[PDB]
What we know:
Chains A, B: It is found in: Cell outer membrane; Host mitochondrion. The first copy, chain A, is α+β, with helices and mostly antiparallel strands and 120 residues long.
Amino acid sequence: MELTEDLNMELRVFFDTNKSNIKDQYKPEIAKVAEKLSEYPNATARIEGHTDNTGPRKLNERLSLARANSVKSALVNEYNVDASRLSTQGFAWDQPIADNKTKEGRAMNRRVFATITGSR
Amino acid sequence: MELTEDLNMELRVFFDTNKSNIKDQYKPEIAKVAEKLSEYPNATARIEGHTDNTGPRKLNERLSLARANSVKSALVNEYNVDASRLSTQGFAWDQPIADNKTKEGRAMNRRVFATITGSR
């Protein structure tokens, strides 16, 4: 008489230097997230944006948030997901997941990680 | 894209005095359990039967297990659910959830509680 299905989903989107646009190769992933947000109407998403450590501090604070908002925007405007179900926050270069000393590491740091959770 | 869905279900079936048959009113819930067991192929169920504290101990040890096996049998025979995914155990009157001093309390104890868990 009690039935619960819990959703746990993790999305990773990476960005080009000084850019906050969603590259086409991530559209399929974002579409999958929108699908689950539809299948789990009560689920919410925690979207967090980041940057590598290159450039002015404020540029990165703004860019990291712009990246998170770009992902939210895709869900909201392309998939009609209720905006209030998604939070966005930028962390500039404060939470690296790779070595900023290499191009490859910096590329890993220019990212948006989103955690989608909820039950139905 | 990390994505998982976890299933957690609890089925509660109640029985009349000395009976181990599945009342028709519980068929819809058993049907739902079968549905989820198919939707989550790795899911398993822990079926536990119980009795009120009236009558011989040997009667209730057998009766509690019979009730659990009745639920399992319904799933196995009517819904083609693999028997090995379903465990059954009887607890006689050792695990009451209501006061056996009253008729409604004893009605609550004559039960089978099934916990279904799975992931996909």
